[PDB]
Design a protein around this ligand. Structure first.
Ligand SMILES: Cc1cn(-c2cc(F)c(C(N)=O)c(N[C@H]3CCOC3)c2)c2c1C(=O)CC(C)(C)C2
Length: 209
């Protein structure tokens, strides 16, 4: 079954701001997603020091960037800690509510959209370039789930029947028609070099067939 949920008012407001505000510096979405992947990788690495069996679902700690011109998607894959069903529906959304309030207050005071990561809501910067975001995730303590939202105040959660991941997260960005530059190899390399050159995990930019 597919379960549909309403975003909390603050989150729906943040999504509308990201989608409707005129802001040309859209490239910052990639550093935000890579930062979340890096944080998830730090988490599983730290937990594995006390419990080595937490790496039975995969020892490799990496980030893959996969462009697909045919599907018009940019996928950010990590072998991080992943997210449980409770993380997807409640936990992260609860943390995001206070972060959103602080961010929108900072914007009113003169801060810009690029500072979004300091408020812990950098994931939502994906809506600067994507019309729809699909999140496939697998945490050691739960099943593989698919979260999805095209904004409009709702998101869906379902058990995923695609290729099993072992552990980690895939953020699938269904790009807006005018944002296809983020599928270009030299554009992605430029963005990674500018904003994500010191990430402590291998970042592999896949090339198109
Ligand atoms: C806030 C927030 C961060 N991430 C998010 C989104 C992500 F894709 C990741 C990731 N692991 O790649 C990630 N990692 C952190 C939690 C576990 O380790 C750090 C967080 C999400 C949110 C949401 O509100 C919606 C969501 C639950 C669909 C996604």
């Amino acid at each position: 079954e597919v379960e549909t949920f309403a975003f909390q008012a603050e989150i729906a407001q943040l999504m509308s701001l990201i989608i409707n505000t005129f802001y040309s510096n859209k490239e910052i979405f990639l550093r935000e997603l890579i930062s979340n992947s890096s944080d998830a990788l730090d988490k599983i690495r730290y937990e594995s020091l006390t419990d080595p069996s937490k790496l039975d679902s995969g020892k490799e700690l990496h980030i893959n960037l996969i462009p697909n011109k045919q599907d018009r998607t940019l996928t950010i894959v990590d072998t991080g800690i992943g997210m449980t069903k409770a993380d997807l529906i409640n936990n992260l959304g609860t943390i995001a509510k206070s972060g959103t309030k602080a961010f929108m207050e900072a914007l009113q005071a003169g801060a810009d959209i690029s500072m979004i990561g300091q408020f812990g809501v950098g994931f939502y910067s994906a809506y600067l370039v994507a019309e729809k975001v699909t999140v496939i995730t697998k945490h050691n303590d739960d099943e593989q789930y698919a979260w999805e939202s095209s904004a409009g105040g709702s998101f869906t959660v379902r058990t995923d029947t695609g290729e099993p991941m072992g552990r980690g997260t895939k953020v699938i960005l269904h790009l807006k028609e005018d944002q296809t530059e983020y599928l270009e190899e030299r554009r992605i390399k430029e963005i990674v070099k500018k904003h994500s050159q010191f990430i402590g995990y291998p970042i592999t930019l896949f090339v198109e067939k």
